[PDB]
């Protein structure tokens, strides 16, 4: 090997190197984004036990749906912003027209089979704008009612008036108004959840604001013994290899009121935390700007989940008694796959999305790391967390944290209460054996309940 002479050069101060690295990642967002963003997402999802339990905002959107399946998030928001730049510029159609035709057809299927047409005109003439009242109530929910008074008087906020954009973005960049920007983008997610709920048909449910019991009420009413349940597994399908998926989410976001001034605010805010790469610290800071992007990513992922179901199922989704969506997980009641349905899923995404047929009682439907089982005493269907996935998750080595250990124990205590319902334990062990081809899980249910009983017993999981 013949190498040319290597002569390196450096800056006079390490702080100049820190700023250069942060400025580079800031200047090249959203073209590239560090995988530490999605890695911080995964660390937060795994900590709070799944997507539905990842609701800890000041104002959201009785425990939540807790899943032990490890998270593998992808920066869907970054790809949406990339599609916004390729659309604002690049008027030259470099075969982005077939991407445009595909995304247009996706929005067509989404509207035809999953939506009403009542609110599209209102959202077009009234884009999403966050008012002074929300951002003041947002800070009041965190730092007290008085700190919200200083919040409004510091940034000169007028009551019952939309927060002017010139207060936190100019020349863009967040101009030292970090708590105002974070407050604004928390209201965008709240309005996006409210507006999506308004357009979706009543038989189509998104699990943003839904407790475990409130979701069980929907399951108990619509899911009976012998009822077929369809499932579209999209977890293995990467959205980045479809520019139409990112363009589809962008169009639906725009259809909901995310106009160009809003996208510029979103791209500017999330290009700023990409400039918080260095210094790293010892652990993820788990900030509110990080959470806002996770929820926006989760929102777009959930919408694209409904889109995929709308195009594949067509009228079968519209006539379904009950269809639930959150993240990439979904169940659709009373639909059995056919040849024309499996073909549409094949010629569209190849063999990247599968169709799973399940029945209440014999082939247990799976949803958010849990089984849809029917109680053998009340004959009412419900969702029961996967005990095998919980056992796998409990093997993760963790540093000592007495507060988080109590949260993990109380979360396991709640899961064991559902496992030992006298009408659940039998059919649960049948479901685990049916799904995983393993031996009877009941002795593990016994052992897991031992750990959850007391704080002293939970210590045996970590040991000494
Ligand atoms: Mg549109």
Swiss-Prot record:
Interacts with mRNA-capping enzyme nsP1. Interacts with protease nsP2. interacts with itself. Interacts with host TMEM45B; this interaction leads to viral replication inhibition. It is a peripheral membrane protein. It comes from the Viruses. Residues 227-342 form the RdRp catalytic domain. It is found in: Host cytoplasmic vesicle membrane. Ubiquitinated; targets the protein for rapid degradation via the ubiquitin system. Nsp4 is present in extremely low quantities due to low frequency of translation through the amber stop-codon and the degradation by the ubiquitin pathway. This is RNA-directed RNA polymerase nsP4. It comes from Sindbis virus (SINV). RNA dependent RNA polymerase. Replicates genomic and antigenomic RNA by recognizing replications specific signals. The early replication complex formed by the polyprotein P123 and nsP4 synthesizes minus-strand RNAs. The late replication complex composed of fully processed nsP1-nsP4 is responsible for the production of genomic and subgenomic plus-strand RNAs. The core catalytic domain of nsP4 also possesses terminal adenylyltransferase (TATase) activity that is probably involved in maintenance and repair of the poly(A) tail, an element required for replication of the viral genome.
């Amino acid at each position: 090997p013949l190498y040319s002479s290597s002569v390196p050069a450096n800056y006079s101060d390490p702080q100049f190197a820190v700023a250069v690295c942060n400025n580079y990642l800031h200047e090249n967002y959203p073209t590239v984004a560090s995988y530490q963003i999605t890695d911080e997402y995964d660390a937060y999802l795994d900590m709070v036990d799944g997507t539905v339990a990842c609701l800890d905002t000041a104002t959201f959107s009785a425990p939540n749906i807790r899943s032990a399946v490890p998270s593998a998030m992808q920066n869907t928001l970054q790809n949406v912003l990339i599609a916004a730049t390729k659309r604002n510029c690049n008027v030259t159609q470099m075969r982005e027209l077939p991407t445009l035709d595909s995304a247009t057809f996706n929005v067509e299927c989404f509207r035809k089979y999953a939506c009403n047409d009542e609110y599209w005109e209102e959202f077009a003439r009234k884009p999403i704008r966050i008012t002074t009242e929300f951002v003041t109530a947002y800070v009041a929910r965190l730092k007290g009612p008085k700190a919200a008074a200083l919040f409004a008087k510091t940034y000169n906020l007028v009551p019952l008036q939309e927060v002017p954009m010139d207060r936190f973005v100019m020349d863009q960049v967040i101009q030292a108004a970090e708590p105002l920007a974070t407050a604004y983008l928390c209201g965008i997610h709240r309005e996006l959840v409210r507006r999506l709920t308004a357009v979706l048909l009543p038989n189509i449910h998104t699990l943003f604001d839904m407790s475990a019991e409130d979701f069980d009420a929907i399951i108990a009413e619509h899911f009976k013994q012998g009822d077929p349940v369809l499932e579209t597994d999209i977890a293995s399908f990467d959205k980045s290899q479809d520019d139409a998926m990112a363009l589809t989410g962008l169009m639906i976001l725009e259809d909901l009121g995310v106009d160009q001034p809003l996208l510029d605010l979103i791209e500017c805010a999330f290009g700023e935390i990409s400039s918080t790469h260095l210094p790293t610290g010892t652990r993820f800071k788990f900030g509110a700007m990080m959470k806002s992007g996770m929820f926006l990513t989760l929102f777009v992922n959930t919408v694209l989940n409904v889109v995929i179901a709308s195009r594949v199922l067509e009228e079968r989704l519209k006539t379904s008694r009950c269809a639930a969506f959150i993240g990439d997980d979904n169940i659709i009641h009373g639909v059995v796959s056919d040849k024309e349905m499996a073909e549409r899923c094949a010629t569209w995404l190849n063999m990247e999305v599968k169709i799973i047929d399940a029945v209440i009682g014999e082939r247990p439907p799976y949803f958010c790391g849990g089984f849809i089982l029917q109680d053998s005493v009340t004959s009412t269907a419900c969702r029961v967390a996967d005990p095998l996935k919980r056992l796998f998750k409990l093997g993760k080595p963790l540093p000592a944290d007495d507060e988080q250990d109590e949260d993990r124990r109380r979360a396991l205590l709640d899961e064991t209460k559902a496992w030992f319902r006298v009408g659940i334990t039998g059919t649960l062990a049948v479901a685990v054996t049916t799904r995983y081809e393993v031996d009877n899980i009941t002795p593990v249910l016994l052992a897991l309940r031992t750990f959850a009983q007391s704080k002293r017993a939970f210590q045996a999981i970590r040991g000494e």
